[PDB]
Amino acid sequence: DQEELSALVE
Amino acid sequence: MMRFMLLFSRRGKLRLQKWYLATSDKERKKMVRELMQVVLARKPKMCSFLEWRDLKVVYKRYASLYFCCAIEGQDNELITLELIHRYVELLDKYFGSVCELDIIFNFEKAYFILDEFLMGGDVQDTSKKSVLKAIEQADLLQEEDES
Amino acid sequence: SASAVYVLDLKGKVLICRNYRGDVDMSEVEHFMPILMEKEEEGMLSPILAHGGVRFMWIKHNNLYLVATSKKNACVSLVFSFLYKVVQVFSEYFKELEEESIRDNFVIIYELLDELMDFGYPQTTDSKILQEYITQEAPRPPATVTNAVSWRSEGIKYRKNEVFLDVIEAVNLLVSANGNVLRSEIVGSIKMRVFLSGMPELRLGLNDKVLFDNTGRGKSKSVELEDVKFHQCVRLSRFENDRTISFIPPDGEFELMSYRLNTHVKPLIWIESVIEKHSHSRIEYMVKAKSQFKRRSTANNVEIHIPVPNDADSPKFKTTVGSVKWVPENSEIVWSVKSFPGGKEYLMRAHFGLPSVEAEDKEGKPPISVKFEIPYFTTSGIQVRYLKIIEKSGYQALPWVRYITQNGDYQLRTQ
Amino acid sequence: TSYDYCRVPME
Amino acid sequence: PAPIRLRELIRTIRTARTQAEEREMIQKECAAIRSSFREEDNTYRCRNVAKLLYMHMLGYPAHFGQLECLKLIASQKFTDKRIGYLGAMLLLDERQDVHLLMTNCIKNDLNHSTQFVQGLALCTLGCMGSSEMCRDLAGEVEKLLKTSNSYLRKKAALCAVHVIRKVPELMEMFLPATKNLLNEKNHGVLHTSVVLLTEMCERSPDMLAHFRKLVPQLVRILKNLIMSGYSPEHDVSGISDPFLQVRILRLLRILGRNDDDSSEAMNDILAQVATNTETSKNVGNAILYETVLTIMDIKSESGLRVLAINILGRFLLNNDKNIRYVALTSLLKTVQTDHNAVQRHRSTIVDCLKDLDVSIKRRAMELSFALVNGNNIRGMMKELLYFLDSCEPEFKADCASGIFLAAEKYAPSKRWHIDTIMRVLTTAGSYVRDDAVPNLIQLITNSVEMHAYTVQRLYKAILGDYSQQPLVQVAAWCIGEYGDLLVSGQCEEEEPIQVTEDEVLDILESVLISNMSTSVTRGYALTAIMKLSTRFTCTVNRIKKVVSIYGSSIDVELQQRAVEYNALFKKYDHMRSALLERMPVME
Amino acid sequence: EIFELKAELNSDKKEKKKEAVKKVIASMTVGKDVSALFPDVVNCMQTDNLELKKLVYLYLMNYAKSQPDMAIMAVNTFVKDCEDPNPLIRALAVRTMGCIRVDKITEYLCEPLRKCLKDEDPYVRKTAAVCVAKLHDINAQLVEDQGFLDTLKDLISDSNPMVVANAVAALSEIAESHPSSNLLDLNPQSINKLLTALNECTEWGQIFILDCLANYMPKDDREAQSICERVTPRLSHANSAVVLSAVKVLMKFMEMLSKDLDYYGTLLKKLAPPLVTLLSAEPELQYVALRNINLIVQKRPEILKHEMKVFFVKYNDPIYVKLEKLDIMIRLASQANIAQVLAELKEYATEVDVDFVRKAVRAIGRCAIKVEQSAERCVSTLLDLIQTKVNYVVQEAIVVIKDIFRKYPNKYESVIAALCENLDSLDEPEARAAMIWIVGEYAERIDNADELLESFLEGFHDKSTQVQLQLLTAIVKLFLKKPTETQELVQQVLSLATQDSDNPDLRDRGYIYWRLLSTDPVAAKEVVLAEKPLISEETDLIEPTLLDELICYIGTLASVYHKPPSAFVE
């Protein structure tokens, strides 16, 4: 999925 | 004391499991599927704490990855939330802009950091700097064996 | 019966769909995969799933699901038969029937869906006739669709008329753990390739025992067919009366008939594996394989599948003939013998290493299965005695034939 | 489809 | 050559399209791995074990790799030790009893020249250390506890905690090292040592007596933390080392459970923090959570306890579901003490039963039951019972349970008690435990004056529906015992209903035949009818027929019983009056 | 961008608008909501191009109900298409409109439907035939009003077998709504015509008219024979559904045949081979077939009496197939094959699918009930299973053995020792209770019964209720048999069952046992050890009327669930 790359924190 | 800590994806895939007590592999699996069922079934704005199986369960979802600690009744939920957050901060600094995929491909490193942050069920170092430096030096020592 | 038909992907989402009756919310299909997975864990897997008063009849082909919803006491036999028929049709329209095919042919698939079934009733399902007005490369409907001969259109012309018959027999076999045959049967298939002009009348002549006995040929060699199934083209009523296989064959390739009969012979290929297991250390397979048919005949491309432990390691093989390879992906070894002449007995030995600490879950114990193929051979002794071709123009048309015996469910239980 | 075909009588 | 690296495996497995294809990939790679393991390849053991751990997380078997981890632990390379210990923590178990090798390797690695190795052995021991391993390593732990190096000192402390947890007797052996470590300036060493002390006190009272001396010290340390400046370390959104603070406050709560002096000093600081901490973020609220817990659990100045209860009030009305949960939890902890301090919020608490959050709702329910007295019982019940009726499934069992419990403890009358009981058995029914049935019968059987009334409404209950099983159990049993009182249209508690005998037989036979009736309730009903043989006079022949035909079922119990009973009827028609009369009454 | 999509949707170029709607329904395909483009794609309906037209028709069929008011823009063109000189597009239009569930479009569909119903071409004719049922599902009143059903009934008499078949299907569906009221059955004379169409139409059509025939019932033996002789050949069709419908009408009509004439027997002989061949089909069809076969062997046991072997389960069979197969095997177990069946079950118990193994052992039990001698053999088999030391098998085996002892009380051999040797490491309360009961009932032979039972009092109150009761009865039977080192034991157990017990039922039974010790020992000897009457098991046979009703539903969901349609369809 896309969100597998999304930052945990940001 | 934290009985165990799990990291699992939104879609119920295990990313990390630290057991701070002795349990049979089979039972560990039963616990994991059960708890994961329960937590994932919850609607997004539910309470970050729940009562499961004579224990207290704290969970926070960062992006797509769920962090889930199992704490004893005499322990503080909000502080465990804080320790989880600390853990993701450690991860964030180590990998740099950490995402689930990093945990997926570096689960061993995640275990490493987790073991340099927790032990036996309790925190061993309440500094981010201390822990991160420890892991850093350990990685240097490890890289020595190769070269 | 079917209210809607869906083609789904492996995760259960709709690749393509067709709403036929409007009896069921299409959105109901969203419950298909979750229910399926639910029931599978319970060990309640079933070709028919329910979400209230909604039933899903489903089959699985490659990476696709074909699902039919119904809110009524649906005719399930018809639905499954239909689903498989859709699979066949699609398979003949597109080479490989897979997700990519669906996506990339959605148009003609919509057409085919609208033509195959109306309001839940199957309509025209013959791909070779369907291809006359549902084309990949304004037409009007072929009369064939509405003709008593609905599988062959008029106008077919070949400059060289000829017919091919493939008589293919599959031997099913099931041998007990001790080694005594529990079951054995011959399943036959007659596949034809018909290249004839016009609308010919064909008649098959077999050594059908019932036919011979009714024509005073009981002394001659026959075959007693326990059951026979015929292609649509065959005139069933005539067979019922006097065992006559009469038909106007469709154009090209088709399966004319299937038959089933018992066997009175020793199994064509006999496997005997004995196992010595030294727990926590090693396991050894000593296996002999003997071909029990005429030395004049020869079996090709024979593979002998033998299950081995899932935690086994460091394999060592020795054979008198042929090679062995470990296939861990299927937790088995495969002994391959390329050419296996009759009356021969070959040998094989395998040595595996086993973990010192035992497995957590017992894994299960599949039987030994074998695949083989013997050309110019029939265990049945069936013979296509004649193939009569009747054309108004009486052109010369010579038929051909060949006999192949191969494995069906050919498996030997293990202990 | 590699094996040989024998002819069959139109008897 | 050459065994693929971990990441490559991971990628490959993620390329799988079915669980089947994945399984095949696992089996293939694992085949390679095992065969490599046989060759005793010291080069690629590490990566293979790592790959095996990843595959073990996915649920695939990894037993064959277990004692390979040992080979990595007993290695001399650091990498091998790292992975080996990790895999030792993941794969090994107290089922293997490979205690000797683990123990010896840990011994060797604890006295290692490099601190990180010692860290591996320490973390491993502290995490999964067997009781026996703890026995044999305790000395080494103690010696390691007296190092100067912080990095190993903290782990030494927590490993000491672990060994204490696995063996209780050995805690005293750590006493000499536990003295004056508070003078430390390292927050890690501090925290860990506080954990060790907390465990210690929590184990033995004499240890409490001993360590409650350094209370003013840790009070000063805590006070320093609170009055500390911004340190770019230990600080989280404006608070320094809240883990340490919380640990200290927990230690304080245990150091002064029933003491007043300690309670006084800590009264001063608890006041300070309860007033001074910032509750804008989660951190502050956590500190205040544990603070409140401390203040309320210990014996102290009511002037502060008021303030604590106030804090909990402000929490309970907060919008953050988590906070409200915290409040309800806290209150739940301090109800067995300072009961009235909680009794101030009963309105709000019960109001939380309407909350949509399941956690909130549940805690609210638990607290609600924990608030029932002999006074509010008349009212609270109406609420709880209401809550039972409009309940979502997951709560019903617990709710019925607690209702029964409270009604057992604080029932104004027997009429009321029985009323609520019947109410629960009718509105909840299936959700009540079968094991609750006996405790109910006992209560209706120790209430003689009711009896016939209870029976009346019981029969009246089951004629409606005999689906809810415990209901028909209780019922059919009471019909059995008090059949005469049922039939005798006389009830000195409410207007009796017109009853008969054949209709009773109809309902009991209906219970016997019905698919909904379990085997045990069939038993109940059968024995009941048998009692009706003595308790009734008109139509005994019909029930003789009943027992006769029911003497042949596949049910072992039913057949045994019905056969015995048939023997009685056939031969000893006079003995039933002797043996089929009311049973003795228990507690 | 929707706006450019609209632009190309109205752009004067043919290709651009064609590709526009292609992208539109392609967007629709992947799950999008392309509803907002309703008016734009409709303007592409009036086309010379059949591909575009079909696509637009699909669009409408998908979105019209969601946009009922705008849908009227499709009406004109629609009716026009029902008069197009190409029959293909004509029927296309007809079958399309019958799917749009908007009242207006139905109104406008009425007349062109009427035309197409008597259209010259058979394709459009049968298409209309089905469209009639399509309409009837929307508004039965409307159909009655326009007198379409009469024209349908007349289309049954059509010259073209496809039109015939489709009309048969349609009308048959209509008659479901009008059960016996205004019955739409025809005479034998018509049955002949249907029987001809049967030989003259598609496989699916064959199914249709077989399903139609099935609702009829022959008036005598002569007619029944007459039509059975014309359906019987259908059992050789490759299509399994055809075969199964044939089976249906045959199983239903064979009743009216005189059982003293040979034809009945011939029919039974002729009905077995197709039923076996069904088990060689794809798994789903195997399942369906299996269910219906269960019904049949229950109704006509003579057909598949000796066809046991085909019902053995193969390793690679899906679990459902395995389960059904077990059932059939039990139902076909006779003295002639029990050794082989027991061999099979013994093998099945080796599997790892737990529920399958359980069902298999239980099946051993059922076999032991069905046949007589089997029992001994059965027990032997069971014993062997117990020696596999696999607990979940052991417990089951104990329970079924208990059942066998209960039904056939001649099993007093050395067997009763062997199981006692199993350490009694059993956990399942059912197994414990079974073992307890066994000890008690046969305590005469078990000298150490005295001891064994005693070992189960340790933790009496934590043990299950059933176990408590059975232990009570067991000890009572033991002591009552031999008042030796037993009186103190039974004293203990009675004290536990009455004085220490809070379980009302146990309290009752125990108290009666004490009231029976105290009053009379001989009375108890004649009471608790009374010769029990034989145990009467509830049959697994479905009620004959419900069975006969279920036979009429062969090949339908009813034949899978074994329930009437009224029981599961909403």
Numbering used by the authors:
A (entry chain V): 59 to 68
B (entry chain S): 1 to 147
C (entry chain M): 2 to 138, 146 to 423
D (entry chain T): 4 to 14
E (entry chain G): 2 to 588
F (entry chain B): 14 to 583
Sentences from the paper on this structure:
The interferon-inducible restriction factor BST2 (also named tetherin, CD317 and HM1.24) presents a potent innate immune restriction to many enveloped viruses. HIV-1 overcomes restriction by BST2 using the viral protein Vpu. For example, AP1 traffics cargo between the TGN and sorting endosomes, while AP2 selects cargo for transport between the plasma membrane and early endosomes. In conclusion, our biochemical and biological data support, and our crystal structure elucidates in atomic detail, how HIV-1 Vpu hijacks the AP1-dependent membrane trafficking pathway to antagonize the host restriction factor BST2.
To understand the Vpu-enhanced binding of BST2 to AP1, we determined the crystal structure of the BST2CD-VpuCD fusion in complex with the AP1 core at 3.0 Å resolution. The AP1 core adopts an activated, open conformation, with both of its cargo binding sites exposed for interaction with BST2CD-VpuCD. BST2CD binds to the tyrosine motif-binding site on AP1 through critical interactions involving the YxY motif, while VpuCD occupies the acidic dileucine motif-binding site of AP1 through the ELV motif. Y8 of BST2CD forms the canonical interactions with μ1 residues and inserts into the conserved tyrosine-binding pocket on μ1. The relatively modest interaction mediated by V11 is presumably compensated by Y6, which stabilizes the binding through hydrogen-bonding interactions with N308 and E381 of μ1 and through stacking interactions with μ1 P383 and Y384. E62 forms a salt bridge with R15 of AP1 γ subunit, fulfilling the role of the ‘acidic residue’ within the sorting motif, while L66 and V67 embed into the hydrophobic pocket on AP1 σ1 that accommodates the canonical dileucine residues. Only a short region of VpuCD flanking the ELV motif is well ordered and successfully built in the structure. While the previously observed Arf1-bound AP1 exhibits the same level of opening as the activated AP2, the AP1 in the BST2/Vpu-bound structure adopts a conformation that is much more open than the previously observed structures.
